[PDB]
Enzyme design. Sequence first.
Site, PDB file in Angstrom:
ATOM      1  N   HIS D 132     -16.083 -20.451  -4.071  1.00 59.92           N
ATOM      2  CA  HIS D 132     -14.923 -19.658  -4.450  1.00 59.92           C
ATOM      3  C   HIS D 132     -15.001 -18.205  -4.006  1.00 59.92           C
ATOM      4  O   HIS D 132     -14.053 -17.453  -4.257  1.00 59.92           O
ATOM      5  CB  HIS D 132     -14.713 -19.709  -5.971  1.00 59.92           C
ATOM      6  CG  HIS D 132     -15.545 -18.725  -6.731  1.00 59.92           C
ATOM      7  ND1 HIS D 132     -16.912 -18.851  -6.863  1.00 59.92           N
ATOM      8  CD2 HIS D 132     -15.206 -17.597  -7.398  1.00 59.92           C
ATOM      9  CE1 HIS D 132     -17.378 -17.844  -7.580  1.00 59.92           C
ATOM     10  NE2 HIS D 132     -16.363 -17.069  -7.917  1.00 59.92           N
ATOM     11  N   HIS D 133     -16.087 -17.783  -3.356  1.00 59.77           N
ATOM     12  CA  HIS D 133     -16.199 -16.401  -2.907  1.00 59.77           C
ATOM     13  C   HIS D 133     -15.339 -16.122  -1.680  1.00 59.77           C
ATOM     14  O   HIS D 133     -15.132 -14.953  -1.337  1.00 59.77           O
ATOM     15  CB  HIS D 133     -17.661 -16.067  -2.610  1.00 59.77           C
ATOM     16  CG  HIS D 133     -18.552 -16.146  -3.809  1.00 59.77           C
ATOM     17  ND1 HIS D 133     -18.349 -15.384  -4.938  1.00 59.77           N
ATOM     18  CD2 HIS D 133     -19.647 -16.903  -4.059  1.00 59.77           C
ATOM     19  CE1 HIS D 133     -19.282 -15.664  -5.830  1.00 59.77           C
ATOM     20  NE2 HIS D 133     -20.082 -16.584  -5.322  1.00 59.77           N
ATOM     21  N   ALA D 134     -14.838 -17.162  -1.019  1.00 59.40           N
ATOM     22  CA  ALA D 134     -14.000 -16.985   0.155  1.00 59.40           C
ATOM     23  C   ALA D 134     -12.591 -16.552  -0.247  1.00 59.40           C
ATOM     24  O   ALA D 134     -12.187 -16.630  -1.411  1.00 59.40           O
ATOM     25  CB  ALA D 134     -13.946 -18.275   0.971  1.00 59.40           C
ATOM     26  N   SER D 140     -16.489 -15.104   2.957  1.00 59.84           N
ATOM     27  CA  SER D 140     -17.435 -14.128   2.440  1.00 59.84           C
ATOM     28  C   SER D 140     -18.240 -14.727   1.294  1.00 59.84           C
ATOM     29  O   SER D 140     -17.832 -15.704   0.659  1.00 59.84           O
ATOM     30  CB  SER D 140     -16.712 -12.862   1.966  1.00 59.84           C
ATOM     31  OG  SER D 140     -15.897 -13.131   0.838  1.00 59.84           O
TER      32      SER D 140
END
Lengths: 302, 79, 179, 385, 107, 536, 92
Positions: D132-134, D140
């Site tokens: 979920h950091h994208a 990213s």
Amino acid sequence: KKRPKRLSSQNVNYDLKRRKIITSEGIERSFKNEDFCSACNQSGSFLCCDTCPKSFHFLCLDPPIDPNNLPKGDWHCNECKFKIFINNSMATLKKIESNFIKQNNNVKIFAKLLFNIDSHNPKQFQLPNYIKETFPAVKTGSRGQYSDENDTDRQITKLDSYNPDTHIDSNSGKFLICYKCNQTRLGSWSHPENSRLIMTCDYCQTPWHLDCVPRASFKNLGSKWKCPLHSPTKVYKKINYKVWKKQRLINKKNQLYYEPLQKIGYQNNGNIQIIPDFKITQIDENSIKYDFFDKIYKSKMV
Amino acid sequence: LRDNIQGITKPAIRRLARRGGVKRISGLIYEETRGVLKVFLENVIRDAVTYTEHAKRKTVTAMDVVYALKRQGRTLYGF
Amino acid sequence: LQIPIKLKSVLVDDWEYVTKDKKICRLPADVTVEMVLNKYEHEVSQELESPGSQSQLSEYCAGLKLYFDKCLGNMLLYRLERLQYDELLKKSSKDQKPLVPIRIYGAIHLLRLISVLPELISSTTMDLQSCQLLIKQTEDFLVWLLMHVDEYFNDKDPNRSDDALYVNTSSQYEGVALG
Amino acid sequence: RRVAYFYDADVGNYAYGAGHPMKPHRIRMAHSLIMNYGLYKKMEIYRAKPATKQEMCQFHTDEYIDFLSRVTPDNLEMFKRESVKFNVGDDCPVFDGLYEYCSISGGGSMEGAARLNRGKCDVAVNYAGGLHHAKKSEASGFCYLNDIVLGIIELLRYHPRVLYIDIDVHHGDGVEEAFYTTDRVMTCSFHKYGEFFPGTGELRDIGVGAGKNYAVNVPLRDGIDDATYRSVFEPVIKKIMEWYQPSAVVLQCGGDSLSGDRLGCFNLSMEGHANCVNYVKSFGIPMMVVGGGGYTMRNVARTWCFETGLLNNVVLDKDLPYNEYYEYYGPDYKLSVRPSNMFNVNTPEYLDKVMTNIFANLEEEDSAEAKDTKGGSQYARDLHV
Amino acid sequence: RAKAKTRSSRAGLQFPVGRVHRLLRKGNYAERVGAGAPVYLAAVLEYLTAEILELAGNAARDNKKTRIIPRHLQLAVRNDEELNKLLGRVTIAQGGVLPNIQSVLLP
Amino acid sequence: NEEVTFFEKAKRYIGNKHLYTEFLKILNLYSQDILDLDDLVEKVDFYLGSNKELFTWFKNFVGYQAFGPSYKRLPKSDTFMPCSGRDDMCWEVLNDEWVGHPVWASEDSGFIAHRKNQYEETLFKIEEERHEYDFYIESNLRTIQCLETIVNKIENMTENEKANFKLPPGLGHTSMTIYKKVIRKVYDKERGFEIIDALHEHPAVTAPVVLKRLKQKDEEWRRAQREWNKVWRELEQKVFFKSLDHLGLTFKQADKKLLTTKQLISEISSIKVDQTNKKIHWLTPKPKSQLDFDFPDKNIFYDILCLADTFITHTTAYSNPDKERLKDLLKYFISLFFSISFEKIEEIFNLFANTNIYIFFRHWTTIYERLLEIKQMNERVTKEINTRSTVTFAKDLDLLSSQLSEMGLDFVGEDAYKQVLRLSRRLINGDLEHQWFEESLRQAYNNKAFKLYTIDKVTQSLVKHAHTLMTDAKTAEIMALFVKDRNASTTSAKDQIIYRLQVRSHMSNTENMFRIEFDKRTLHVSIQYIALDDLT
Amino acid sequence: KTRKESYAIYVYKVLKQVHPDTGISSKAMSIMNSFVNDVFERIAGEASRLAHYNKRSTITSREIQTAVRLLLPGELAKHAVSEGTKAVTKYT
């Protein structure tokens, strides 16, 4: 345990490396026994030239060409191609841009200022020396950005160890006192949980605690932290708007200017200084009482 | 102007070596002599530029060259 | 050149927008070279003499246009800033229309152009007598820009209103730009 | 209550990079801690669906999928333009199997969201995702595809309101940036504000437009224990459940918040990590659970097994069952590890101030995808050796 | 008066501005001495000291030594090309020379 | 009611000149009619947040009675970024205007990874080695079962289908990347493409040899993985608990620098000047001070002495009568300070004194609170050492046989307190190694007791802080004066002032005087660093 | 007995700033002290002859900058005067 040669996979590959012995014996039978950009000051995808050792980035080129398809001929330079195209050419034995002026139609104020950009290398905007020395507070950065509130090579703390530091002053030793709370709260060595983290300011050395203002990190490795007690860079109002983007610091030949006006009802869009367009007058405390008296007189009509 | 290291003449280098008592001169002597003359000249010229830029001057005087030579321990008389 | 202190502050703010705040000016710029050059064309003829410097100012404007056409990719346009120069040709290579920066670039690029001209006039044999009126005309441009600072150069931000001639750069354009 | 697990056979058969911190080893071995204990009595196993090109593409752009579906390490030279603008450069190494892993993870996420949408399964847990950091077009924080936002827009078909709770992994921001002006989506994250690689955000981020006072963010310092985590988790969650009338939870477990990691130092044991889902499971609101990261696969596999045992409303024993990866964990052979010796930096005056001002500011292609092949052949019953 | 603050802390320096000023005044180099000259000299000396000590520490890191000895200083001085050019006529005590062997000597 | 005194009151409140100029600039910025109510209240809450009376006095004239630095808006020109499959409500809930970047918050500072020391570094190195080898062997066995699946289905009936078995890529499964990956892994850089192409275009011919080059490789990988796991578990037996320590490893260097007298006097003077300010002209400073110490039980006053004598009999630096005189004086402070006559050794009264006895007493309560913390978790550790035992699945290769702490260093069979005190006494006597004690302490506990890692060091300081307690003339003189004035019954404000003026005029003004107030009510002890009202 | 001028503590805090875990022996520290004194003497003499050349009785930071550019060759001087520049930028 101390001998990782035999204990590891020495016969096949290594600890992680791939020995050649898989490629040597593979029991196969299907073969049936036989540089740097001076105009960029950055690092990335470089492209050199066949005539000069200089290099440029793929993006800074005057013909926009996509990086997945490089130009052919190894991209002969702008200088070399424009010296073999227009500069060193027919009608020799004279200065080349002398005949340029006779080739111009309805333009005379640029006698020789259009031929140079025709045959010069690509170059990004670099700040002029007089402009960058005009503002001493404005200086170049690591690769050349603006650096005023930011922040050798020339070719850690986990326990209660840093909290005892930055409490005794290095010069006088007097305890720095926090603003919102009247206790510095160093804490106890017997009970570490009573220790509280405190901060410092890089401009006026104002002490501040981690509990009074919401902070979690340390802004000291590339950006100078500013305490919330100075003049902001820009303000925001909501009632098309004015943000008051400071006025910046001019210093050449003391061009800030220093003269007392009446200091009340003047509307100099901020831009004040304290002594006990681009016009700034001094502010003393008497004019502060004067214009606050005016403000609370005009604010309360009833 | 951009390429002037060829201005140092090869028979001039021959004459300079004849003043030094050299009997036989090889063909690769000239390029190395031009290189060492270039680096020595650029060192002394950089020193003279610094000397004349400390004094807010745009022309280099002979006294600047004398003091630049005195800085490197190669003081020359007459100027 | 006698650059005004307010105008120097505007230029330093432009550098700080380009570098630190890392934002990119609008490709469909609200202000461009028409509302300054046509302003000079229909403005200086009402308070000065009709003959004399009017035709020379007109040919100066024409030369400024011709210089701005071929100088956009050479003396201006920072490493982040050049990205919008690329796809404008990509639209131009398929629409069968040549691209000029005359109608599409704002007055801050005019400020950049008139700030990079002192460091290139000394490269060639610049004739001082034929150019003294050119520094005079540029200083006229600085004092005129010192006059008009409110209705032309806005200090707003794109966070609440998109009329500041400056919009932010996403990580897509950061990745394709700062590679 | 009824809970379901989503797992693919070739979901741990990837290689994220040689020596790089985040690994794909965490998920598959976690399944080895599911069947070996005997937890399959309530496990509804569904295989991850091999999602196609345009089936999942309702969030990310077309060119992004077209890049990741046609990139191999063999031909990285001719795709070097898109490698540096899609954040797949030195931050994210290029390996074969990117498109298929992303497709099966998105298929599992959509399957869990749809199974929550029908209401046949009360809790939809899935550790195959967790990326979920994208963002919409970038990769990213060592994550390529955002696997929660498609779940958000899937539960938005039926549930008008959702609750996103982000336990600290690497300061996640994609779910927060995807829905900021909408009041239908509520986002919150307990994390560490520091000099991390993908770390964005601030406490002052409260929401703008119609999403004002619905995008809160609770920052913590470097090192918080279980008691202070409970004391900071209870009041804000109680206040937002009081003032929103919730309908669904899309809370994500923290893989990098356990004791011992390559990046990030957070002192939560099994009890501290378990209380975060206990507090939100006490309400009874239906929930779909997203997996997490974890730079150490043994600790994150142990806490994932503990979480899976906890969603059955039982307490699993303090011993690990034998499996093919039985020697990965520590010599103690206990599920509940001991907390690390991190100094308690979170003073509760700052926590009280955060509670105070938080209380102040708060007052196409067969869509809705629930089709996938049935599992049961992924038997993790080996013999002791 | 007021609180005593050194000029090195105001200029962000560790080398003493006042001691350099005293040695400049008592060293009869000039009749009058500017205010910025001791600050500039202290900054130059501090930068040179930091560079030389960093090079010595780098040369002593692979030698399993955590203390600077004259051999490490000699290695740091003669290894750097610009330090060798600046200290061309400088002899370092207890330092020796670099351990370099010519190619013709090796069989 | 008036406003002309508020400005000089604020000037006296701020104190610093430059902060007053900054406050003047902020107030002028408000005055020039661009600042809203929220900005002025949020700036007064930071400028004048220490006092609420003047705040509420300011609120009667004017007052009430979006996003941070990141998440900046994008224009409506680049949103038309054509995303296939967008639904009707997909544009309603998803906005591309508000995005955030890590470089925006970093502000051109790069990214720094939080790395640990070499212990965690090699732990992560062997952890990723384990990950790579386990992934390799599981991919190998998955390919064993996959290649064994697709041979019986075409080997059983006929042979015409063997020659022509053209298949789409995927091998009849939902997988699309794994088999080419392992062919690339087990073959050369150029061979693997044509091996997988042959496989794809002609199966049932190269399948037996690609199984032959994958079975013996799998078994060799399994054997090397077994021996790798053996040496790996031998590594975890030492490095599992060492990686969980980040402040106890540096506690050896820390205890040499935070146990000095300067750190302690700065520590007490911190709360002393915290109590000193904001208590003048409106309040009276109480004689009782903060930093109190609580003594719940009395059995901890003796057991540490079982180490202390064990120290000075072991130490050969001291002479013969030094040990017995140290024991005599220490029993003297046991007798008179705690008002205890004698007890079996386990295996308002105010006093004025100076710095050395103060820091001796500070380390005394430091060791006391360390042992109080130890006995605080004594019940839970004595509860779950019993549940801690070897499992029945670890007898294959004799795990937990590395001779780390099996020599009796474990807490099984006895109390944790007595066993750890015996272990510390073995450290004192030199029979036990220091790193063996460190591993035993980090193994028997949950790494919470990091304070006891340098206990011998601190008790060395303790006997030093006793050895200098009866060495110089001044401390011996004040000790004799305290003993001569000790009648085990002192009344407040009756005879303490005479003793205070007698002891104040004898020492110089360089050594400050501190006081200890002890009472029998729950053994309460308070320490005050009194500096005023003593010389008058 | 009598007090002697030395650069002990300044060089030591510079070393601790650049290398927190690296010490220095007495002989090498004496070498560093003599190096500092010799560079001080060389820069002072160069600035003195520069001031005597221009009939200048005042040695400012410009004389020190010129001396550092003269005596120190290469880019090693340049960063040095850059340090001096920010030194002035921290002093004013």
